[PDB]
């Protein structure tokens, strides 16, 4: 009755594995030889943002690369001015349990969410001189993990239950759903063309989705524990993942398999966040041992360290122009490095 | 000064925001926060009614002291991902039903949950308040059914006091950490009016010891 279907699934998996194995002609390290290394990289703190009285959980840069937004365990969303360190806006939240935030690419709206299973959208530019709640989106059954704007009227979300969704802000209803995971979805990343996105769950797997049709395209495996971070290559044809194994990995789409892994014998803790650099030559990772590491993307070499925090590093980000790097931590302080 | 007439106003605005944040932080540090755990069919609703969607909230006051209670029993997700958010609470309240001993086994599930929570790495130095509910039912069943279904090794007498002491010591001997934290046990039923007083006493003791440890006098 059902044994035949399971045997067919096993046969298909074996066929896929053989097909992938046929394309592997040469490893990345072999090609990336006779190329001059990058050398030691030294970067200095330049700013320090203060005024948060709890642990910081998320942050996001603005498209102008001057303004910032950050969230904390206390019910507060603060917007910063990078160059002067001035505070522009402080927004109070109804629920103190928050886990993610986003910045609209136009600069008119912000988004928030957490353990309450709701996504709140706030309007920044109005005619009364205050910030007010513009929309509340509900329908998930688990805590929200991430959210990202596509335009002024579209947003995708990820939930603690095995599902992602696409919303319509005007009507407040869901227009598409993505269900192929068995675990908890922890992160997602959008493509530069805003046509595809990738997800990572607690079953040690990653998936590639199509926004319009709403179907999965490819699945990637190789990790041994939960995946907590994921990011896109600047070109848009590869991505990087980080898990609890204390290792990072690089995956390719056209080849449909893994390319390289970044690990060190003296690192035994998990990874909380991952980011790339303009031109995609440096990979920045945040660890649980109060530090941040810089890796060469084309080589397994480690080209620097970033140690200025007294607790766990929760989040990090790079500007669209590529001038500075921002990091947050559980010590309640955000820093900017250049 | 190298500042135009329009940046000083921004500085003043930022300073007024800082003042507001300070006042907010000061007003939020005068409340005592508690986390309520326990498996289903334990008596959480009874105690909640005796004291005044995802996570749930509750507030009450006693002797000019304000308590907030967090209930997280409606999540139904991986607990290793969002439980570190509660690191920092004053204490934890655990509910267990004495009646459901003969009723794989509910008592063993409660013991497993208690052991898992007590020896967590985020709750190393947080005390625990244990409530044992439905004493009358336990005293109405012990006479008919012996206390050997749960513990085949039991070698005592079919008496309420001895059985209650046996259960209490079995629950109390699961904490590997003995010097860092202490457990406060209490017996209650469906009709009581002195549980909030017990909570108040335990909280005052915990706060005094924490203060006496921050100042290095211990």
């Amino acid at each position: 009755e059902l044994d035949q279907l399971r045997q067919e699934a096993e046969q298909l998996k074996n066929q896929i594995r053989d097909a992938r194995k046929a394309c592997a002609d040469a490893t990345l390290s072999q090609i990336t030889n006779n190329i001059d290394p990058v050398g030691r990289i030294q970067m200095r703190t330049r700013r320090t943002l203060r005024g948060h009285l709890a642990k910081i959980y998320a942050m996001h840069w603005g498209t102008d690369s001057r303004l910032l937004v950050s969230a904390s365990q206390d019910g507060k969303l603060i917007i910063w001015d990078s160059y002067t360190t001035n505070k522009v806006h402080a927004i109070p939240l109804r629920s103190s349990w928050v886990m993610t935030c986003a910045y609209a690419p136009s600069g008119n709206y912000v988004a928030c969410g957490g353990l309450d299973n709701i996504c709140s959208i706030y309007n920044l530019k109005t005619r009364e001189g205050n910030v007010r709640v513009s929309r509340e989106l509900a329908g998930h059954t688990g805590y929200l993990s991430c959210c990202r704007f596509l335009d002024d009227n579209q947003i995708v979300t990820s939930s603690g239950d095995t599902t992602c969704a696409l919303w319509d802000i005007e009507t407040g209803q869901q227009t598409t759903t993505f269900t192929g995971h068995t675990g908890d979805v922890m992160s997602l990343s959008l493509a530069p063309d805003t046509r595809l996105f990738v997800s990572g769950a607690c079953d040690a797997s990653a998936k590639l989705w199509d926004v319009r049709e709403g179907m999965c395209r490819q699945t990637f495996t190789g990790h041994e524990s939960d995946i907590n971070a994921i990011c896109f290559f600047p070109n848009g044809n590869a991505f990087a993942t980080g898990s609890d194994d204390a290792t990072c990995r690089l995956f390719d789409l056209r080849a449909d398999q893994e390319l390289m892994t970044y690990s060190h014998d003296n690192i035994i803790c998990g990874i909380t966040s991952v980011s790339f650099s303009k031109s995609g030559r440096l990979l920045l990772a945040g660890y649980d041992d109060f530090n941040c590491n810089v890796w060469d993307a084309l080589k397994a070499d480690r080209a620097g360290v970033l140690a200025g925090h007294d607790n766990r590093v929760s989040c990090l980000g790079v500007t669209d122009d590529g001038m500075a790097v921002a990091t947050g931590s559980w010590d309640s302080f955000l820093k900017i490095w250049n | 000064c190298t500042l135009s007439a329009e940046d000083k106003a921004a500085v003043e605005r930022s300073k007024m925001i800082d003042r507001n944040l300070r006042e907010d932080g000061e007003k939020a540090a005068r409340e005592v926060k508690l986390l309520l755990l326990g498996a289903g069919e334990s008596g959480k609703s009874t105690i909640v009614k005796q004291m005044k969607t995802g996570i749930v909230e509750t507030h009450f006051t006693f002797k000019d002291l304000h308590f907030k209670m967090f209930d997280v029993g409606g999540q139904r997700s991986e607990r290793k991902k969002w439980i570190h958010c509660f690191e920092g609470v004053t204490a934890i309240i655990f509910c267990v039903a004495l009646s459901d001993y003969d009723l794989m086994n509910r008592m063993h599930e409660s013991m497993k949950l208690f052991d898992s929570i007590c020896n967590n790495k985020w709750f190393t130095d947080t005390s625990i308040i244990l409530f044992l509910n439905k004493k009358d039912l336990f005293e109405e069943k012990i006479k008919k059914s012996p206390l050997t279904i749960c513990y085949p090794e039991y070698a005592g007498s079919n008496t309420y006091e001895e059985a209650a002491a046996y259960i209490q010591c079995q629950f109390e001997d699961l904490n590997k950490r003995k010097d860092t934290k202490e457990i406060y046990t209490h017996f209650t039923c469906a009709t009581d009016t002195k549980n909030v007083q017990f909570v108040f006493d335990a909280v005052t003791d915990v706060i005094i010891k924490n203060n006496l440890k921050d100042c290095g006098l211990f």
Partner: single-chain antibody
Amino acid sequence: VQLVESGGGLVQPGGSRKLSCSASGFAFSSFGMHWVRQAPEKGLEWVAYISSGSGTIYYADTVKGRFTISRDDPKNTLFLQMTSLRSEDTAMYYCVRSIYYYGSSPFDFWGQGTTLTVSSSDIVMTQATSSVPVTPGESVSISCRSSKSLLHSNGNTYLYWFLQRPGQSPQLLIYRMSNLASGVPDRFSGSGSGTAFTLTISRLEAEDVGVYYCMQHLEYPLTFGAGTKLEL
């Protein structure tokens, strides 16, 4: 959003008077406020200013020690007390809004104004035209020159353009060199450099007729420019 202004009337020399303004429709407690005045036929003239929180106050050199300005935030009112009124104090008074943070637009909303009659090292902004004729559908340009560079080290050029129509209070069009306000069509444009600035209109309608003013916000006491009237 509205600001109503009370008080005013006929006063004898040497008397005293009180003027009040009531606001409704916005967060009155997070805005700074100004007072401006206009003589019966002359241009605009700044008077005084209050910060948000009443932590900073400024006055014009001609009213120092004679006028007082105050605020009341729970009741949403603004007050101006005037003592020892001269014969040069006859004018129409306006109350103005201003909010200061990165990327804001000050001087964006004005009041209706009240009339008061009395019985009988500063930058200079100059305009060298007036009563310029025009026909609908054509393109027009207005010019302005200052007596000092308005360009700051941070890269901002502080210059503002205002339009006043017959029988109406002024309205903001450009709240900084090359920055269009909200709700105003795209016909208007502004450009300049150093100490020379200009405002250009692609095509004008019947409603784009009035007097145009230029203002600087580099430092106090916020001197105004002269008027430039357009005739159909």
